[PDB]
Design a protein around this ligand. Structure first.
Ligand SMILES: CC(C)C[C@H](N)C(=O)O
Ligand code: NA
Ligand SMILES: [Zn+2]
Length: 433
C-alpha cells in the first residue's frame, strides 16, 4: 500500500504518480499555523489503484471530489483515503480535489536536524519540510520517489506578501486580501516546494544565459534581516555556469534565495532556496544550488540513499572551490579528518538518525572523490552529465548508481565506489596517484 521506504515505511502510496498539484492556500495570519486549502491533484498510476491515499498531518478534509464529482473519502491517522468509483489504471489520469483547513502538525522526528513541516515564527510562515513535512500543510504523496509539478495560488493579507517555487505570474487583490500565483513547471519532490508568507520583498536580477538556456534571477528578502545579509553580485551567475558545466543544463527556469531572518538550516526548495540568514554563506549557497540537480531533479527512490543528494551536493562545493582557484584536495582532506574520528556505516542509511549525518555528506563526497581520481576529470565530468540524464524522470538508488558506474566507467571504477558505498570501513583518503 505504502511506498515502502526503508526509513519511513508508512509514507506515500505505491504506484501513485502525482503529476500536478493545483493548490489554493489561504494563510489568514502569517506567523500562526492555521490555514485553509483547496488542492486539485492530477494523478496517474503505475498499477491499478482502487483508492488514492494521500499523506496529511494536522488539517482536516471537509470535502473531496474526483473528476469534478463528489467522492467517498475518509481521513484516518496521517492518511486521507479516497475510494474511486472505478480503479485508476496505468495510462489514465484523474482530478482529485480536496478542501481542507486546520493547523499543520510538525513532524518532530528524533534523529532529524530539523522538525520538518509548516514553520511559524516572527510573523513568517514557510515550508521547511524535508524529509516528510509537506504532509503537514498539503495532502500529498509525501515521498521523493514521486516528484510533481506545482501551481500554488497563495491568499494572504494585503499587508503581507508571499513567494513560492516557480515563476511568479499574477497577483490580485480584493476585500483587503491578496492572491499570488506561482507555477513550478519542472517536477520536484514535495519537500522541494517552496512556500513563504509574511513581510518579504521580491528582488530581480538580470537573466543568466547558460548557452541556449535562459535562467531567470530573483531573490526574496524578508523584513528584519541582519545587516550584511546579501547575495554577492555576480556570484550566482558564476555558480550557475560552473555547476551546469559539470552536471548539464540547469533543470529549472529561475533560481534565487529567499533570505529569512530566522535561525535554521538552508533547504534547497526548487528554484528558490529557503535560506535562513544564519546559513547564508558562499558554500551553502553553492550547496543549495547543487541540490537543484541532485535532489530536486534527480530524486531519491528511498530515504536511505540521502547521500545521493547530500554527498553530491557536498562534492559540488569542492568543484566550486577548484573553479575558484582553491585546492580541492585540501578540502577533501578536511572531509576525511571529520570522518577519521567517527565510526563507519555503509552509505545506505539503516535508521533515520543517519540520513542527514556526517557520513551522508562527507563520506558520500569522498566516495565521489575516490571515483573521480580513479577515472580522470574528463571521464568523471562525463559521468556526472550521464548520471543526471540517467536519473531524470526516474528515482535514483545506490544500487542503480553502482550499476551505472559499472556500465559507463568499468568494473574497477565500480569496485572503487563499492569500497566506499559498502563495507562499514573508512577507506584511505583518496589522493592523486
Ligand atoms: C534541511 C536539511 C535537513 C537538508 C538540506 N537538504 C541540507 O542542506 O542538508
Ligand atoms: Na509524479
Ligand atoms: Zn544538502
Amino acid at each position: 500500500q505504502s511506498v515502502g521506504d526503508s526509513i519511513f515505511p508508512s509514507l506515500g502510496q505505491r504506484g501513485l504518480d502525482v503529476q500536478h498539484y493545483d493548490l489554493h492556500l489561504t494563510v489568514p495570519r502569517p506567523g500562526e499555523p492555521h490555514l485553509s486549502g483547496d488542492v486539485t491533484l492530477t494523478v496517474g498510476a503505475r498499477e491499478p489503484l482502487s483508492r488514492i491515499v494521500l499523506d496529511l498531518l494536522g488539517p482536516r478534509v471537509s470535502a473531496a471530489q474526483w473528476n469534478g464529482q463528489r467522492v467517498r473519502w475518509v481521513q484516518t491517522a496521517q492518511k486521507v483515503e479516497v475510494t474511486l468509483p472505478r480503479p485508476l489504471r496505468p495510462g489514465e489520469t484523474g482530478r482529485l480535489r480536496l478542501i481542507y483547513a486546520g493547523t499543520p502538525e510538525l513532524s518532530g522526528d528524533p534523529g532529524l536536524p530539523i522538525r520538518p513541516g509548516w514553520q511559524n515564527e516572527a510573523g513568517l510562515s514557510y515550508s521547511l519540510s524535508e524529509p516528510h513535512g509537506t504532509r503537514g500543510f498539503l495532502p500529498c504523496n509525501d515521498h521523493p520517489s514521486d516528484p510533481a509539478t506545482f501551481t500554488v495560488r497563495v491568499t494572504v493579507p494585503a499587508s503581507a506578501s508571499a513567494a513560492a517555487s516557480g515563476l511568479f505570474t499574477t497577483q490580485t487583490e480584493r476585500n483587503g486580501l491578496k492572491t499570488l500565483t506561482f507555477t513550478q513547471r519542472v517536477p520536484v519532490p514535495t519537500y522541494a516546494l517552496g512556500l513563504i508568507v509574511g513581510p518579504l520583498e521580491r528582488r530581480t536580477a538580470p537573466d543568466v544565459q547558460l548557452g541556449t538556456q535562459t535562467v531567470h534571477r530573483r531573490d526574496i528578502y524578508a523584513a528584519g534581516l541582519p545587516a550584511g545579509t546579501t547575495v554577492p553580485e555576480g556570484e550566482t551567475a558564476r555558480m550557475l555556469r560552473v555547476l551546469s558545466d559539470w552536471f548539464g543544463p540547469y533543470p529549472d527556469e529561475v533560481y534565487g534565495v529567499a533570505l529569512l531572518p530566522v535561525r535554521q538550516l538552508a533547504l534547497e526548495t526548487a528554484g528558490l532556496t529557503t535560506m535562513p540568514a544564519t546559513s547564508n554563506r558562499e558554500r551553502v549557497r553553492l550547496h543549495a544550488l547543487a541540490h537543484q540537480w541532485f535532489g530536486d531533479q534527480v530524486t531519491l527512490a528511498d530515504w536511505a540513499d540521502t547521500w545521493l543528494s547530500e554527498g553530491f551536493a557536498t562534492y559540488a562545493e569542492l568543484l566550486w572551490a577548484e573553479s575558484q582557484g582553491e585546492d580541492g584536495q585540501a578540502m577533501a582532506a578536511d572531509w576525511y579528518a571529520r570522518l577519521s574520528v567517527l565510526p563507519s556505516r555503509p552509505l545506505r542509511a539503516t535508521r533515520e538518525e543517519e540520513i542527514f549525518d556526517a557520513s551522508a555528506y562527507f563520506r558520500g563526497a569522498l566516495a565521489l572523490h575516490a571515483l573521480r581520481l580513479k577515472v580522470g576529470d574528463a571521464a568523471f565530468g562525463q559521468f556526472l552529465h550521464s548520471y543526471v540524464k540517467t536519473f531524470t524522470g526516474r528515482p535514483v538508488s545506490t544500487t542503480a548508481l553502482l550499476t551505472l558506474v559499472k556500465t559507463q566507467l568499468g568494473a574497477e571504477a565500480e569496485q572503487t565506489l563499492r569500497v566506499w558505498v559498502e563495507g562499514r570501513t573508512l577507506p584511505p583518503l583518496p589522493e592523486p596517484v
